[PDB]
A and B are shown apart, each in its own frame.
Chain A
């Protein structure tokens, strides 16, 4: 599966 995007929520 791909990595998560860098969190910026």
Chain B
């Protein structure tokens, strides 16, 4: 039930990463490391840089 909002665009460079756009809302799934695992509104998941998203 935790939301993050992207602060910057991120174009994925590996299969496990996720493309995000600035202002996109995402579900936060795992915040244990410096890259966080998120789910988007297309029901896709992947890792993004934790400093590119803001916990709401």
* Contact flags B8-23 to A (C-beta < 8 A → 1, else 0): 1010001010000000
Task: Say what secondary structure dominates the interface of chain B.
Answer: mixed
Chain B interface residue number, banded: 10 to 19
B34 touches A6 (CB 8 A): yes
Task: Say what secondary structure dominates the interface of chain A.
Answer: loop
Q: Which residues of chain A are near B49, meaning CB under 8 Å?
A: 4-5
Mark out the residues of chain B between 25 and 56 whose CB falls within 8 Å of any chain A CB in the assembled complex: 33-35, 37, 47, 49-52
Chain B residues at the A interface, C-beta cutoff of 8 Å: 7-8, 10, 14, 16, 33-35, 37, 47, 49-52
Chain A residues at the B interface, C-beta cutoff of 8 Å: 1-2, 4-9
